[PDB]
């Protein structure tokens, strides 16, 4: 990173304290900007969906890795779990979406509640595997909310086969009233759906796949109990990257953990963390992982700083963190406290290969969560961290347990009415990310932080 | 302390300018690290309850005894009132807790207003020192405000006698109604209460006991009129320390009062305050005082602050001041802003021995004040300041002297509905400095100082 | 009727106009009073619900019909709709409810959202027919809305064989936790459900049950069309009696359809309406009604009087209208604006034989409408009228029906907290109309009318 002459503070930079000065350039479009990773994860966009259970769930596995990004699955979901979810997410056309699907005997009542998973607007009505007709909100409105399916449900739709160019499906849907064109196998079964939105995105963004033409997934591992085990059936499940995961990841336990994992020898990215300095990621790679986790307490007011007092500012931990791995071969991801597009270009910027954000994400159709409204009627998800599942671990044991345990915290997310789908925000965040690159001059994520130059600025 | 390259701010730094950078750490268990003081204090633990008549009531010097604490009795209180507490305090069950009591004849008035005496939920009503029942905030809901105690009052409830092992108490409560065991004494008469998460308390805290194992107890002593007499009276009281404390501690008035109190060869720690300078610090030790109290209008929008000018930030003050101490053997408490955790956490790491809390610990059960409720209904209770009994000092005469003397300010601390009673605030306290241990690698207080690197963070 | 002396106002009489003033009695408890019906409906209980869509469920034919009433199944009603709607009340239990049924595959949203439709309390989870568990609305609350029912159903449960007498099921409940005892067939499959205030109603009300000792279920039919055709096929469906309905009584095609339906000798009783006159109520009966149905805009300020100012005081048409029956040997129904217990009793002492009641029973959980909440989170429900279904009736020919034709209007029904069930306002009914006998001093409905004494209030 370069900084501006005197720009050197006597503290730590957080994603508020620094800006991006403009360099000459000859990128003119965001097109011409190569957004792809270069750190063995495979994604061809620079975000990566965090290791919580409020957000890492099926179809926001398939959603995100679709356009170019990788879910973490959450540690300690059970073996049958992630073979289930990795079986699903590597099942996945690559250009067309899973939409919600409804049988003729299904509740109204279902269909308005069911159909707010995706992005699309529109569910497909299925008889035997065939797609009979559409179900919208409007198609609810008014009705008696115990009908069914068959009583409001759409007979005309916009149809394709799987496989059509996703130019001639846009313009299929041009003049219908439904954004939504429905994928038929050869068999005539439906196959999936794509708008002409999604077509678009098809063109723009570059799925992450693995060796054979599957949706890239990872998943997470604590490190109690047998870490060497778990990780070793994780990756028997199909994982495509593990993460090992753990609130302090300076400290022998996790240096020992690495050692298992990197001992079986599974042919898998491995990341590690969290730290938040040079010591611990020089430490981290040197036990056998090749990705660190930056992020401690990233926020001056959240739990882990105003409980303990440990922590550090973000940008600056990554601009030490990056330096002490890029020096060993190694790369880091941003963890935490990342809310705008401006804190993924800056945290990029400032030495990372890949940005993972968390609670942001939880906040849209795909996440797991259910929807919610508040006292005004706007919609939104609730967010929640991992508690003791990123933490060092008989009545009296589990109480004795419990008085010190640190509390899951749960946060209003508000869903954007423009942008509800996380493919929105991958919009919103890459669009960001694209014109940084131009401003400063920069054709890909290494130019970026090789020609970047930085500034402090005050208070005001 | 170790401050991160180049952070050498042209400014103090209260606890919210500061933050903990992780170390390399072998310190799995929040429960490995020994919290023990070397201050000489007799506490396990760093808190310590400041002498406030808001605060340091005799059932506030017993919780927090037998949770490794002390309490300080505030100064100018009568002699014979002194004696009295210490007779209490040192009379305790080292397991068991005090409950509140109730006469058949009690109004259901008496028994609600009563029952937030204490942290238990239960009251035991006592007929001629037998146990007969236990009357709860349920039994008095519903029923005539006249009514007495014994028609409210429920006679099944779990028993056991005292001295059983807590780790027994605890399976023999889980199917009992309400979560109160009481213990009674060989001859059947009322010993004490111990609830299952207080039996958990015994095998996590050490009680503070003197050589006596009798419950450890403070005295604080103000400087005007004869400061060797009130200093004798307090310590053939049964205190176990002294507190000399002032406003000003850099004052020559003041190193004459610890020089007369040491002369006097009590055998016990002298705590002498307040300084937040280097200075400060020694000319107190070459006084004779053992512990140096630190904390000078702390807060910058305080009233000490806005009247006058006169303060320093508590981080800088107690790290300046800890430094000076270490040599010549000292130690230094930290009194004052402390509002959470993290504050307790970087005063130990500043070099404090142990650190004063009086206004947060206000708003829980034990403290002399009454509960009350704002105008939605949560409980609270009023918080206040010395005043002059903590400054140096005709009708004319008592007008003028009156006329400028510093107010008494009064400031809400709400109760938390899920930690009601001081003990929970222990709790939440003990986590976060175990937890800032394993973040630094620390398995002690001493090591906590040794290994802790800090750094400064913006405004943002 | 009689009046105390004066009381012959120049004005008709509302149900807020009069009185009843207690006379000598010698009927002790509410319990000697026989509340059965002369009129030939089959009733044990003065109440038949109104044949309104909005009240004219099954749920509600069932419910009501075991407690001694009647429903009328609105007219239009699809003869196919008829046939399942009777077959579905002729084939319940006399004693044993229906409750709601769930799937192990069941979402939770679809658990809640059924729960609310019986008054039990709690649904009985059914695979092959076979009870399995129960899911209460506690059990909803705090999981995911989308689980599954197996995952929240309650395995443990009272069950009994259909045929226990009521009193042994009300002591087998008596400790039961939750207040649901299942009932099994002898092959063990579900046969119903039984609370304890279940229990207690079969000892309090007897059942409305034709000659082969099944529910009795009332239709209704419009004269439009061809009236004496459709009047047969209900007939033919299994009611039990029927209601020629329109909303002027008193008009020759009213009179013509009476005709065409006493030609066809079905057996049945036939009810007429809606006539508020002596000589409207005797033409219906000469046409071949036994039973004139009474009640035309008896709201001061309903869409009615407001439309055409025609209408009358519902107390004194039933007085004029019982009146002209009774030299006919005919019976009158009392039709609209009963709001109160009060209206039942003053409705009978003046003369009808029954009393008709709709939008109040809309606001039951066993009506057909779903359960809403408003502002206050408070639970009720949507009442609305017949509109064109009761009036006489190319594309230019349709639209001058809509532009002149009558709106649909609504009404917010709230529940009762202590009354949610329509069994419950069938206690809170019948209570009062058994204790304006006793007042009264009558052992019967036919001695409620002969010894009533009335007077007239002013609007003090
Ligand atoms: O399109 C759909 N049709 C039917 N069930 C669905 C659909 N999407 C999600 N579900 C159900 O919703 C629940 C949770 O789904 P998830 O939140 O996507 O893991 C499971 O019971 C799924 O079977
Ligand atoms: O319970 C928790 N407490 C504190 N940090 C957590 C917890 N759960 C997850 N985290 C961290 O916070 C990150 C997400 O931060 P976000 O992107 O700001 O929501 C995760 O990737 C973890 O590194
Ligand atoms: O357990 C108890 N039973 C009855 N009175 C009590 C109990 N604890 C304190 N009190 C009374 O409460 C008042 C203040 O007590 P303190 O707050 O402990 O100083 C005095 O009148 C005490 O006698
Ligand atoms: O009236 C007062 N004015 C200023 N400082 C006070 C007063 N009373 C007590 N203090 C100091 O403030 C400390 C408590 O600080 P707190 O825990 O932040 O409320 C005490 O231990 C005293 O050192
Ligand atoms: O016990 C039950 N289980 C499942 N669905 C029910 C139950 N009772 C009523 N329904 C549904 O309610 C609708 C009929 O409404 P109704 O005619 O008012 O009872 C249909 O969608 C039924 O499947
Ligand atoms: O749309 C409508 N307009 C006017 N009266 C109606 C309508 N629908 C039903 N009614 C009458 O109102 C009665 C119910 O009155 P309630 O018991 O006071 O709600 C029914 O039995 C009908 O006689």
Redesign the interface.
Request: proline share 4%; charged share 25%; glycine share 8%.
């Given at each position: 990173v370069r900084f501006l002459d005197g720009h050197?503070?006597?503290?730590?930079?957080?994603y508020?304290?620094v800006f991006v000065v403009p360099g000459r350039s000859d990128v003119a479009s965001r097109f011409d900007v190569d957004l792809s990773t270069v750190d063995g994860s495979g994604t061809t966009i620079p975000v990566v969906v965090a290791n919580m259970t409020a957000v890492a769930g099926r179809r926001m596995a398939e959603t995100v890795a679709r356009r170019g990004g990788i879910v973490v699955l959450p540690q300690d979901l059970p073996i049958t779990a992630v073979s289930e979810t990795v079986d699903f997410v590597k099942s996945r056309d690559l250009v067309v979406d899973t939409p919600v699907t409804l049988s003729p005997e299904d509740?109204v009542?279902?269909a308005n509640?069911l159909l707010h998973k995706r992005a699309h607007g529109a569910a497909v009505v299925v008889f035997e595997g065939r797609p009979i007709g559409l179900v919208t909100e409007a198609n609810c409105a008014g009705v008696?909310?115990?009908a069914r399916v068959r009583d409001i449900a759409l007979s005309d739709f916009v149809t394709a086969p799987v496989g059509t160019d996703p130019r001639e499906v846009f313009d299929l849907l041009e003049h219908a009233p439904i954004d939504v064109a429905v994928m038929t196998a050869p068999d005539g079964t439906l196959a999936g759906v794509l708008t002409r939105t999604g077509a678009i995105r098809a063109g723009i963004y570059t799925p992450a796949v693995d060796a054979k033409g599957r949706l890239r997934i990872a998943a997470a591992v604590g490190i109690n109990g047998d870490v060497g085990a778990k990780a070793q059936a994780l990756a028997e499940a199909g994982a495509d990257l593990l993460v090992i995961d753990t609130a302090?990841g300076?400290?022998?336990?996790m240096l020992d953990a690495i050692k298992a994992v990197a001992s079986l020898d599974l042919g898998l990215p491995l990341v590690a963390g969290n730290?938040?300095?040079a010591?611990?990621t020089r430490?981290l790679i040197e036990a056998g992982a090749s990705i660190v986790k930056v992020g401690?307490?990233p926020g001056?007011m959240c739990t882990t700083?105003?409980?303990?007092?440990?922590?550090?500012?973000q940008f600056?931990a990554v601009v030490e963190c990056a330096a002490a791995a890029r020096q060993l071969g190694g790369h880091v991801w941003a963890d935490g406290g990342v809310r705008h597009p401006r804190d993924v270009a800056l945290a990029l910027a400032a030495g990372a290969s890949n940005v993972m954000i968390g609670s942001w994400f939880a906040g849209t159709y795909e996440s797991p969560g259910?929807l919610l409204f508040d006292r005004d009627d706007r919609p939104y998800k609730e967010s929640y961290g991992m508690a003791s599942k990123r933490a060092?671990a008989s009545?009296?044991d589990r109480?004795?347990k419990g008085?010190?345990e640190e509390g899951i915290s749960t946060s209003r997310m508000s869903l954007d009415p423009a942008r509800g789908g996380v493919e929105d925000l991958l919009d919103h965040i890459t669009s960001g990310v694209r014109s940084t690159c131009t401003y400063v001059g920069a054709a890909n994520l290494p130019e970026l932080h090789e020609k970047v130059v930085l500034g402090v600025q005050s208070?005001a």
């Open positions: 050197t503070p006597a503290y730590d930079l957080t508020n304290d509740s009542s279902d509640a008696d909310r115990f302090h300076h400290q022998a336990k730290v938040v300095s010591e611990g430490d401690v307490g001056a700083r105003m409980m303990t007092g440990v922590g550090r500012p600056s259910d060092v009545s009296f109480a004795r008085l010190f208070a």
